[PDB]
């Protein structure tokens, strides 16, 4: 489809790899008794492998010539969830962390010896500050417009 790739629900190397893995597991399964705990563990492993392959096929990925899925970070609308959808999420969480830390530092800048508050964290003020990062984009944008983000 894109860059000479094959849809993952149509390629044959995917099925061949699945068969190889299943046979490799079943070779070890035969050794033990069918009712024994290792048999149950190996059956669970086989079920997990089958579910993973089915999910990968149903999710609309694209295997390559050799048989493995390929990620597309290009920006096509059919792969929103491949890179772009997770990435934004990360930024959100990441921003949270940063924002919170910055706030805490300012919250201890007033006192005469902030080093004691840096090496021994206090829990009440930190817990007050932690949940303010849930709306970090709005506060950050307002501070940028006001001009309090950058020192002078």
């Amino acid at each position: 489809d894109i860059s000479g790739l094959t849809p993952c629900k149509d390629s044959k190397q995917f099925a061949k790899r699945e068969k190889q893995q299943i046979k490799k597991l079943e070779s070890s399964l035969k050794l033990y008794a069918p009712e024994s705990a290792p048999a149950l563990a190996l059956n669970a492993q086989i079920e997990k492998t089958k579910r993973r392959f089915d999910n990968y096929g149903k999710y609309g990925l694209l295997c390559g010539s050799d048989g493995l899925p390929h990620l597309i970070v290009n920006g096509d609308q059919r792969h929103w969830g491949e890179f772009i959808t997770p990435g934004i999420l990360f930024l959100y969480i990441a921003g949270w962390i940063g924002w919170v830390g910055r706030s805490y530092l300012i919250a201890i800048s007033g006192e005469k010896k902030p080093a004691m508050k840096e090496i021994i964290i206090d829990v009440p003020l930190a817990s007050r500050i932690i949940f303010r990062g849930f709306i970090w984009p709005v506060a950050a944008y307002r501070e940028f417009l006001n001009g309090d983000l950058i020192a002078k």
């Binding site: 024994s36 705990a37 290792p38 149950l40 563990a41 669970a44």
Partner: peptide
């Protein structure tokens, strides 16, 4: 020996 191995996979 089977029970010892199963102790890890109880859940």
């Amino acid at each position: 020996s089977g029970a010892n191995f199963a102790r890890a996979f109880t859940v």
